[PDB]
Every structure is written in structure tokens, then in C-alpha cells.
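TOPIC: backbone geometry
CONTENTS: sequence, C-alpha cells:
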Amino acid sequence: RALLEKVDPNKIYTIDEAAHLVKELATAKFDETVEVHAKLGIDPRRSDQNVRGTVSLPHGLGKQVRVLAIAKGEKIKEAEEAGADYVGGEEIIQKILDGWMDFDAVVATPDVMGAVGSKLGRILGPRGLLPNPKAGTVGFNIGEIIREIKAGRIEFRNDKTGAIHAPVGKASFPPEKLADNIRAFIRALEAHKPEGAKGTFLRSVYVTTVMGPSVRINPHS
């Protein structure tokens, strides 16, 4: 844990330095999702300054992503038709508990999320693989969700604190690809600067994981 002192909390790192720090400190036990969090120069209580859109990450998305869709009843067939690599009903949960992890991403319909969250929270959670409606990975339009990932896009939306975050890779990625993905998210955010927002837009930007320290980065590096 003392390992924490490898990250200087006051330094503004380059994106490449941050990518390397990610890989130096990543737990070896499982593959963690790497996020970028930014504090935005917006008023989060006014809808005309909402920031919402997609990032087309240059690495790790598209046809190659093995998507698991968990659904129920009719939506199983829709997930199959949309080309999810793996589809299951709630019966698939036990298979995951038994050690099946061939998938890279999980999406789900709302009706299975109680069971998914309760049984797989402690497994998918620490890995960053838990579906969430705010990330656009839980919904009844399961086919559209699958197609968006296969088209190489991830969704983002600011929160009520005026911050925003999105996954940009895994700790297992080569650092150059992680760095590429971090830059891509920053460029996607900048392309979505609202008209009317004043002052600095990217006030601070960080590379993060759920369980680890944040690494502050220069978004123009």
C-alpha cells in the first residue's frame, strides 16, 4: 500500500508519465479499468451547459471487443441479433462466479440489474465492468447499446458536481495505447465545450482507478 508514494499528488504529469505510473502501480490480481476524470468550467445546474457525447477511443473498442449482454426474455434475442459476442440470461451469472471471464465488456437490461449488482458487484465492480445507466450500458434498447460499443464509441455525461469521467482503457494496455486513449478522451471533451461556458473549460484533469490514487495530468501533453 505504501506504494502510494510513487504518485506525487502535487505534480502535473504528462499523459505519458501518467500512463507509465498506471502500469507501475496496477494490482496484478485482476485487470483494472483506467478512467479520466475532469473538473469542468460549467454551471452544472443549467442544461445549456451540459456536456454529453461520445469518445471514439482509438484502441480497445470496436469489433474486437467481446461484449457480454445480460438480459431476460425477449431482449435476449435482440442482443443476439445485434451481434453481442456472448449473450445470457441470469443463468450466466453463475458461470461468471465459476470463473468464466472471456468477455471484455458487460451490458444489461434494467430487469436483470438487481441480480447482476447483488451477485457480481464484488467481481465486476473492482474490475470496472459493472453496467450502469449513466454510462449508457444499462437500458432496454440493448441492441443500440451493443451497436454503439461495436461502432467504437463510449458515452460520457457530466455529473451534478460539474465533473465528468469515462473509462479510457485497462491497466493491461501498453502505455502508448493508454496514452493515446487518454488524449482521445480529452479531445472529445474539448469538442463538446458548450457555447456560453466561460473561463477555463478543463480546469483539472486526472487519470484514475476506483481503488487507487489519482494522477493529475496536463491535458495538452
Observations:
- DSSP finds six helices and nine strands in the chain.
- Strands lie at 33-40, 52-55, 67-70, 86-88, 105-108, 154-157, 163-170, 202-208, 215-216.
- The domain at 8-59+153-221 is CATH 3.30.190.20 (Ribulose 1,5 Bisphosphate Carboxylase/Oxygenase).
- The chain has two domains: 8-59+153-221, 60-152.
